[PDB]
């Protein structure tokens, strides 16, 4: 209950018996952090029959949004003020029988920037410790050609022409 | 069978062929050539004459910067995958990050302080 | 008691044969502590036959040896590591069995 | 209107991320190719500006009358274990063949 | 020519005795190896009673039967249950 974005809930038995019809039931298994008893799908299961009753009694109705037959099954949480009035609350996506909450485009980016820059800052502090300075010496860490080489290069090319490389 | 008597039976290890590498979609690989006559020269190759390039100093710094770069790259990849509708979405579920505390002020203060 | 110690140690060693649990422990930082390497060194008593007689899942022992190389624990923090090791394990297992079976059957059918 | 503006802000963010990534890459590559001769003034000369400019720019972009980012949500559509040569090109080599592991991981 | 032939013979001898030494190494492992057969049968039945020693007849890429104690067996497993 600390962070709903950082929780994943699963169950093996329901995994092989999973189909477009049963996705809501899997979310409904109860003891699932994402879904709640307050949702009306619960009040429907308690009562009897599931039909256009979500359009009659309007409120918290978890409904499947998009579905790929094998694994992908996205669920959306809506809050209805009246029939033909829908307000989307959140989205919980199930990949490989593993339920996650869809991250906000912005909470994800905030956490991401924080981790990267924290790494950069640790690296910087560590690099600061090793540099040592003196005005005479300059900087240090805490851890040419005699120009007679043109004739040597001429001799090298001469021996190249004389003794060819036979790689 | 009515009271089997177990005797000292010695068995030799069944190491006739080893599967060094196992590929996907079948395709077994028997890399082990079971040789020694050439293994002496193979070990002579290891012998000297005179973990990345050097990598004894600044290893921590190098790894830290690499990790930061990797996180940056992953975020960029996700953003480029949102840049289009290819295997992705962007539906704005009218929600509201409601913080039930005075977290902001305290956090700002402590952060600035440290 | 010593009985509970034996049972918990057996369960832990049999659980170590799981790459998911190994990646769990590696990410959570349990391997970096110098206490866990000594615990692993103590856990080598399972190599004896009298102790190996009670091991239901034998795939752990070999894995345990790798954990002593001190380079296996520095790596494996990645999830791709667990991916690859479980891939190779299940591949060896299933391919060995079913490939022996299929090779025998196919050769017997083709030679006729 | 708001969607057009949102897309514009998203593209600006993409640009910023790309620039930062490039900078970091060049920096670490240069460290590995220089090793010696590198001195504290130059190392500080590169870290400071590369990080300061990019980070300040990103925060500035995020807080200039841009769409509310907590509103929108990202939920995967199709996953196919098929080889893809276009996502490998588009993401510059990482994250190929959108499999099942990649959506919980990213 | 004699020297060359001698060197070839030496190489042959080397490979042969190296293989003989490998056989000797097997024999040294084998000596300590001798044990009760019934015990071998019981251990084989133990490791083979489940899906561990042999892949199941119908085991495709997607099975709860894993080479490890799954996660539900771990959830009831003494290990963390008693550590809690």
């Amino acid at each position: 209950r600390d962070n709903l974005l950082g929780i994943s809930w699963v169950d093996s038995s329901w995994i092989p018996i999973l189909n477009s019809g049963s996705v809501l039931d899997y979310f409904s298994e109860r003891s699932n952090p994402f879904y709640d008893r307050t949702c009306n799908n619960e009040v429907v299961k308690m009562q009897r029959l599931t039909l256009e009753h979500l359009n009659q009694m309007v409120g918290i109705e978890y409904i499947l949004l998009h579905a790929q037959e094998p694994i992908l099954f996205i669920i959306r949480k809506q809050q209805r003020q009246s029939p033909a009035q829908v307000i989307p609350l959140a989205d919980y996506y199930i990949i490989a029988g593993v339920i996650y909450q869809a991250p906000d485009l912005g909470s994800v980016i905030n956490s991401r920037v924080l981790t990267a820059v924290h790494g950069i800052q640790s690296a910087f502090d560590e690099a600061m410790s090793y540099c040592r300075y003196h005005p005479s010496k300059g900087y240090w860490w805490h851890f040419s050609s005699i120009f007679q080489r043109q004739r040597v290069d001429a001799l090298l090319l001469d021996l190249r022409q004389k003794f060819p490389p036979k790689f | 069978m009515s009271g089997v008597r177990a005797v000292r039976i010695s068995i030799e290890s069944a190491c006739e062929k080893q599967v060094h590498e196992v590929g996907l979609d079948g395709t077994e690989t028997y890399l082990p050539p079971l040789s020694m006559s050439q293994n002496l020269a193979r070990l002579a190759q290891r012998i000297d004459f005179s973990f990345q390039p050097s990598l004894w100093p600044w290893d921590s710094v190098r790894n830290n910067l690499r990790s930061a770069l990797t996180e940056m790259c992953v975020l960029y990849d996700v953003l480029s995958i949102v840049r289009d509708k290819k295997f992705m979405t962007l539906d704005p579920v009218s929600q509201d990050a409601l913080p039930p505390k005075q977290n902001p002020q305290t956090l700002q203060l402590i952060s600035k302080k440290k | 008691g010593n009985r509970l110690r034996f049972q918990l140690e057996l369960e832990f060693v049999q659980c170590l044969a799981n790459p998911n649990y190994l990646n769990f422990l590696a990410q959570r930082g349990y391997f970096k502590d110098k206490a866990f390497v000594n615990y692993l060194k103590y856990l080598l008593y399972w190599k004896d036959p009298e102790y190996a007689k009670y091991l239901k899942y034998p795939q752990c022992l070999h894995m345990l040896e790798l954990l002593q190389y001190e380079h296996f624990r520095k790596e494996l923090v990645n999830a791709q590591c667990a991916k690859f090791i479980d891939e190779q394990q299940i591949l060896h297992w299933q391919h060995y069995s079913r490939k022996r079976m299929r090779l025998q059957q196919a050769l017997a059918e083709q030679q006729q | 209107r708001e969607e057009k503006q949102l897309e514009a802000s998203l593209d600006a963010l993409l640009s910023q991320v790309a620039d930062l990534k490039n900078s970091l890459g060049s920096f670490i590559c240069k460290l590995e190719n220089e090793y010696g001769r590198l001195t504290w003034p130059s190392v500080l000369d590169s870290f400071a500006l590369l990080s300061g400019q990019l980070n300040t720019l990103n925060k500035v972009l995020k807080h200039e009358k841009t769409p509310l980012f907590r509103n929108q949500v990202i939920i995967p559509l199709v996953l196919s274990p098929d080889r893809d040569e276009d996502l490998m090109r588009q993401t510059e080599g990482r994250v190929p063949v959108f499999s099942h592991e990649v959506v919980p991981d990213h | 020519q004699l020297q060359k032939q001698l060197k070839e013979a030496e190489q042959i001898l080397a490979t042969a005795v190296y293989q003989a030494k490998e056989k000797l190494k097997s024999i040294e492992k084998a000596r300590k190896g001798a044990i009760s057969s019934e015990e071998i049968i019981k251990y084989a039945h133990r490791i083979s009673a489940s899906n561990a020693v042999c892949a199941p007849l119908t085991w495709v890429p997607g099975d709860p039967r894993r080479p490890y104690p799954t996660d539900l067996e771990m959830r009831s497993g003494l290990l963390g249950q008693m550590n809690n």
Partner: peptide
């Protein structure tokens, strides 16, 4: 189609 792949998809 595409069941989670313990061995890689063929």
């Amino acid at each position: 189609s595409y069941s989670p792949t313990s061995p890689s998809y063929s």
